Amino acid sequence: MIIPVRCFTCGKVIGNKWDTYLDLLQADYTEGDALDAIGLVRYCCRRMLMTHVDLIEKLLNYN
Amino acid sequence: RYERFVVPEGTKKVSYERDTKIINAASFTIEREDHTIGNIVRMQLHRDENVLFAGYQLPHPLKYKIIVRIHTTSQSSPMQAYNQAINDLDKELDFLKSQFEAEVAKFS
Amino acid sequence: GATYQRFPKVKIRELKDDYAKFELRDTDVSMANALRRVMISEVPTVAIDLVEIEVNSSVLNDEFIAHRLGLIPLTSERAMSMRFSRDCDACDGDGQCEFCSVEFRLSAKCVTDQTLDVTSKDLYSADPTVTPVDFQRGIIIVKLRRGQELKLRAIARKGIGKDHAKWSPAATVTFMYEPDIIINEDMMDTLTDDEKIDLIESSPTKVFDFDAVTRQVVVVDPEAYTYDEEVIKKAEAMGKQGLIEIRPKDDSFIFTVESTGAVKASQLVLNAIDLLKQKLDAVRLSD
Amino acid sequence: PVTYVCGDCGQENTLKSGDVIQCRECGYRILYKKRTRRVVQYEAR
Amino acid sequence: IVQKVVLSSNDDGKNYATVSLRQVRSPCLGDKFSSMHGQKGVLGYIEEQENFAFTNQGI
Numbered sequence: 001m002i003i004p005v006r007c008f009t010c011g012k013v014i015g016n017k018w019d020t021y022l023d024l025l026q027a028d029y030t031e032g033d034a035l036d037a038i039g040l041v042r043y044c045c046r047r048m049l050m051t052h053v054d055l056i057e058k059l060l061n062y063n
Numbered sequence: 064r065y066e067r068f069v070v071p072e073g074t075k076k077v078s079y080e081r082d083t084k085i086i087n088a089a090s091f092t093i094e095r096e097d098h099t100i101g102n103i104v105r106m107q108l109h110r111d112e113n114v115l116f117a118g119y120q121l122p123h124p125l126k127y128k129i130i131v132r133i134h135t136t137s138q139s140s141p142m143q144a145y146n147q148a149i150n151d152l153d154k155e156l157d158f159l160k161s162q163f164e165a166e167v168a169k170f171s
Numbered sequence: 172g173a174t175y176q177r178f179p180k181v182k183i184r185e186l187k188d189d190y191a192k193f194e195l196r197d198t199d200v201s202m203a204n205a206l207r208r209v210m211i212s213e214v215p216t217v218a219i220d221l222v223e224i225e226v227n228s229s230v231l232n233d234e235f236i237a238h239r240l241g242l243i244p245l246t247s248e249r250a251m252s253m254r255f256s257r258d259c260d261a262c263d264g265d266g267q268c269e270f271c272s273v274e275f276r277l278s279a280k281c282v283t284d285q286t287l288d289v290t291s292k293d294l295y296s297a298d299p300t301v302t303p304v305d306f307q308r309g310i311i312i313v314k315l316r317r318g319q320e321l322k323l324r325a326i327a328r329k330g331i332g333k334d335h336a337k338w339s340p341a342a343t344v345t346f347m348y349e350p351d352i353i354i355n356e357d358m359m360d361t362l363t364d365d366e367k368i369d370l371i372e373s374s375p376t377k378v379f380d381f382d383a384v385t386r387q388v389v390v391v392d393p394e395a396y397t398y399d400e401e402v403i404k405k406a407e408a409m410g411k412q413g414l415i416e417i418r419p420k421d422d423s424f425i426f427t428v429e430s431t432g433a434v435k436a437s438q439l440v441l442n443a444i445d446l447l448k449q450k451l452d453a454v455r456l457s458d
Numbered sequence: 459p460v461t462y463v464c465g466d467c468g469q470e471n472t473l474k475s476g477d478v479i480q481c482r483e484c485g486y487r488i489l490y491k492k493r494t495r496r497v498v499q500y501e502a503r
Numbered sequence: 504i505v506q507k508v509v510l511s512s513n514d515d516g517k518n519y520a521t522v523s524l525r526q527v528r529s530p531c532l533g534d535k536f537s538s539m540h541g542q543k544g545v546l547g548y549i550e551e552q553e554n555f556a557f558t559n560q561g562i
């Protein structure tokens with residue numbers, strides 16, 4: 001539903017990086033450059049943000 | 064219920080047992096330890112000169128318990144070699160801590 | 172009266188809060204591995220362990236919220252001085268009590284017609300020493316729309332990463348062997364320079380490079396090597412055997428330490444050394 | 459005080475007998491049991 | 504844990520009740536998994552993190 005607090009494999013805090021990643025995507029960045037500018041170096045941490053599905057917005061409408 | 068981690072039962076933390084087939088040979092059984100203590104104690108005993116066998120083993124990889132086997136020469140005994148290894152490891156850790164504190168104070 | 176002691180040597184190359192890089196030499200790989208294993212699984216921190224929920228009107232269930240709250244890093248400099256809750260006799264758990272427990276509270280309710288975020292900046296402790304770590308907006312917990320509400324009370328305790336990964340202070344601690352690279356220059360002259368470019372282009376990272384100012388090759392940054400056999404398999408594929416050679420330089424390592432911020436990156440190494448001393452002392456023989 | 463809500467409008471009925479299962483202000487036949495006030499404890503694990 | 508209780512009725516005079524129970528599971532030692540290429544299997548061991556073999560970045 002929401003972004004997980006930590007990466008599954010290593011345990012780095014990523015839970016305060018979703019809206020920043022969406023803001024960088026909205027200003028016409030590639031996904032690799034949006035993750036480079038945000039500090040993620042290991043590919044385990046990058047696949048947490050490239051592959052997240054944000055289901056909380058759909059859950060908020062349908063009650 | 065998540066409490067049986069580092070606490071042993073009414074057993075000893077370390078139990079000594081001097082085997083009968085080979086002389087100057089013993090097996091120390093340590094409760095609530097794993098690869099961390101066993102590997103450095105093993106590789107410190109190999110640095111000793113009156114140690115002919117040193118080896119550690121988990122009896123089962125899902126148990127938190129190790130067994131350490133030492134065979135010495137006649138110039139020493141297994142218990143002396145065990146205690147000498149442990150004291151050398153403490154003095155090495157103290158030297159390391161002093162070096163690290165000096166470097167951290169240097170970097171600021 | 173015998174001594175068989177080692178003397179490790181430390182040289183820090185970059186140090187800041189939450190990050191440390193340092194090279195360590197003249198000890199064994201068993202000691203470097205002991206420091207790594209203890210820093211991942213033995214150094215204690217403080218994290219939320221009990222959650223008591225009064226109102227939950229959000230679209231998320233209670234185990235989701237409790238598992239999210241368990242993984243938020245708190246400031247834990249007191250964790251070496253406080254005691255586990257299995258050892259404390261001055262209380263019953265179940266509330267705020269020094270040496271074993273911290274109480275947190277949270278309450279939120281949306282009244283606007285916009286969606287309200289509930290972050291980790293809404294958790295208020297009854298102890299001003301143990302707070303959430305400051306990094307932004309804060310870590311998201313839940314979102315509310317209108318007329319929904321979250322209200323709870325938490326109990327944060329002390330533990331280690333061997334028990335649950337929420338108590339681990341290391342997002343990633345690792346080391347690597349330091350390499351020793353020799354290039355036989357008497358066989359390096361035998362190669363024309365496009366074959367030298369063909370050799371250098373086989374390496375995945377930037378370990379070798381080509382200086383045409385002397386029309387030769389040079390090993391620059393010999394720590395970007397990753398111990399794959401690609402350049403050696405390339406030189407064995409050209410037939411020119413023994414042109415390069417790489418051996419791991421024994422008793423020399425490079426540590427990299429990152430912390431979640433609960434504790435500093437120097438304090439993690441120092442607490443690892445203290446705990447490893449404390450378990451070397453409790454194993455002794457009395458005799 | 460066990461009370462029910464209507465899943466269509468939201469009127470808070472109070473059923474204590476076993477006559478029928480029906481709302482008043484709608485006429486529809488679906489009701490939910492309301493969550494009263496109590497504390498439930500969880501591990502954060 | 505009780506999630507909801509729903510009470511319904513019919514048009515020909517019949518009452519229904521439904522109670523829902525919520526459970527939360529992490530994988531245990533005989534749960535079943537498969538890739539996207541038909542390689543199914545069962546979980547046979549859960550290993551600690553510091554016992555796993557690691558790369559030069561710590562993955």
Ligand SMILES: [Zn+2]
Nearest residue numbers: 007010044045
């Ligand atoms: Zn990661």
Ligand SMILES: [Zn+2]
Nearest residue numbers: 259262268271
């Ligand atoms: Zn207490």
Ligand SMILES: [Zn+2]
Nearest residue numbers: 464467481484
């Ligand atoms: Zn109605």
